[PDB]
Amino acid sequence: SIDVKYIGVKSAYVSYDVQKRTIYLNITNTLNITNNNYYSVEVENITAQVQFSKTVIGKARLNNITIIGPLDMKQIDYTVPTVIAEEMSYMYDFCTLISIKVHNIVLMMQVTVTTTYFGHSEQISQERYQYVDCG
Amino acid sequence: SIDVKYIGVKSAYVSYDVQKRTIYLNITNTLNITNNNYYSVEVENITAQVQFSKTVIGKARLNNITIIGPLDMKQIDYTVPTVIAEEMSYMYDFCTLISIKVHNIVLMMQVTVTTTYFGHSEQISQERYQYVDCG
Amino acid sequence: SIDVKYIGVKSAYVSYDVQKRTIYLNITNTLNITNNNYYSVEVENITAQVQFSKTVIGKARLNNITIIGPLDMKQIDYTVPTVIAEEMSYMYDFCTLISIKVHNIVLMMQVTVTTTYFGHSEQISQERYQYVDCG
């Protein structure tokens, strides 16, 4: 939540890129950098009291205080039917990156059914790195 | 939650890239770097009291205080039917990266059904690194 | 949660890349680096009291205080039927990376059904590294 970057090629602080037919004679680079970072993050001071029934006195009657009732979840359930009477395929691939009828699924459940969580939770997900190179 | 970066090629602090027909004569690079990092993260001071029934006195009657009732989960259940009467395939692959009818599934459950979690949880997931290179 | 990076090629602090027909004569590089890192992470001071029934006195009656009722989970259960009356395949692969009808499944359960967890949990998952190289 401070530096969340998606960088396409490269990242630096001081960068030089001298390319593609240049002449670079008797330069003088003189850097005097002072780059300090001071982070103070998530400094928390919590004081909680969580009760469902506090201090019942004298012939009282309680019932069904908290009900998280009939629950139902169906997260990923998709149907891909296919009825083909006759099929023919011809594929001539060269230096390619194909994917035919693949199912890539990622599921992350951090804090599911629970009660009274304290502190810190986190979830990070970085996708695959794929690549094809021909000379 | 501070430096979460997805970098395509390279990462550095000081970087030089001299490429592709350059002439680079009698340079003078003089760096004086001071790069300190001070992190103070997640410093927590928690004080919690979690009761379902505190201090019942004198002929009282409690019932069904907390009910996380009938629960049902079906996370990943997908149907891929296929009815083919006649099929023919021809594939001529060269220097490729194919994937035909694959199922890649990742599931991560950190803190599922529970009560009264304290502290810190985390989940990190980095996908596969695939590659094809031909000269 | 501080440096979670997905780097495609390379990582460094000071980097030089001199490539592909360059001339690099009588340079003078003079670095004076001061790069200290001070981490103070997850420093926690917890003080918890977790009771279901505290201090019942005098002829009271409690019942069904906490009920995590009928529970049901079906995480990964997918159907891939196939009815083919006649099939023919022809595959001519050369310097490729194929995958036909594979099932890659990763499941990680850190803190499942439980009560009163204290401290720290973590889950990390790095996918496979695959590769094909032809000259």
Residue B100 to residue B65: CA distance in whole angstroms: 53
Cβ under 8 Å to A: C residues 35-94: 44, 46, 48, 50, 68
Rounded Cα distance between C46 and B50, Å, is 13
Dist CA B97 CA A99 (whole Å) = 8
Bridge-partner residues for B73, per DSSP? A73, C73
Interface contact C73-B68, CB threshold 8 A: no
Cα separation, B67 vs C50, in Å, equals 18
Distance CA A110, CA A121 (A): 7
Token pair of A4 as six digits = 């969340």
* Shortest CA gap A97–chain B (Å): 5
Tell me if B135 sits within 8 A of C134, measured CB to CB: yes
Measure CA B96 to chain center.
28
State the nearest Cα–Cα gap between A32 and chain C, in angstroms.
10
Query: In chain A, whose CA is at the least distance from the CA of C77?
Result: A77
Please name the method used to determine this structure.
Answer: cryo-EM
Angstrom distance (rounded) from CA B134 to CA B60: 80
Task: List the single residue in A56, A62, A98 with the smallest CB-CB distance to B98.
Answer: A98
Residues A57, A36: Cα–Cα separation, whole Å: 60
For the beta sheet containing C10-11, the strands, ordered from the edge strand earlier in sequence to the opposite edge, are A10-11, B10-11, C10-11
B74/chain C closest Cα distance in angstroms: 5
3-state secondary structure of A3: strand
List the structure tokens of A3.
């530096």
Cβ of C15 within 8 Å of Cβ of B19? The answer is no
Asked if residues C1 and A121 have their Cβ atoms less than 8 Å apart, the reply is: no
Neighbouring-strand partners of residue C84 = B84
Rounded to whole angstroms, the Cα distance separating C56 from C135 reads: 80
Distance CA A126, CA A61 (A): 53
Scanning B1-135, the segments in alpha helix (DSSP H) are: none
Strand duo A28-32 + B54-57: pairing: unpaired
Q: Are B61 and C61 in contact (CB under 8 A)?
A: yes
User: Are the Cβ atoms of A122 and C44 closer than 8 angstroms?
Assistant: no
Strand order in the sheet with C14-18: A14-18, B14-18, C14-18
Give the minimum alpha-carbon distance from B23 to chain A in angstroms, rounded to a whole number: 5
Those residues with Cβ within 8 angstroms of residue B60's Cβ, 6 or more apart along the chain or in another chain = A56, A57, A58, A59, A60, A61, A62, C60
Measured CA to CA, the distance from residue C2 to residue C4 in angstroms comes to: 6
Contacts of B133 in chain A (CB under 8 A): 132-134
Cα torsion A87, A88, A93, A97 to 10°: value is 0
Contact criterion met (CB < 8 Å) for A120 and B115: no
Which chain C residues are within 8 Å of A129, Cβ to Cβ? 6, 8
State whether A113 and C6 contact (CB < 8 Å): no
HSE (side-chain half, CA atoms, 13 Å) at C15: 24
Is the separation of the CB atoms in A35 and C35 below 8 Å?
A: no
Nearest Cα residue in chain B from C122: B122
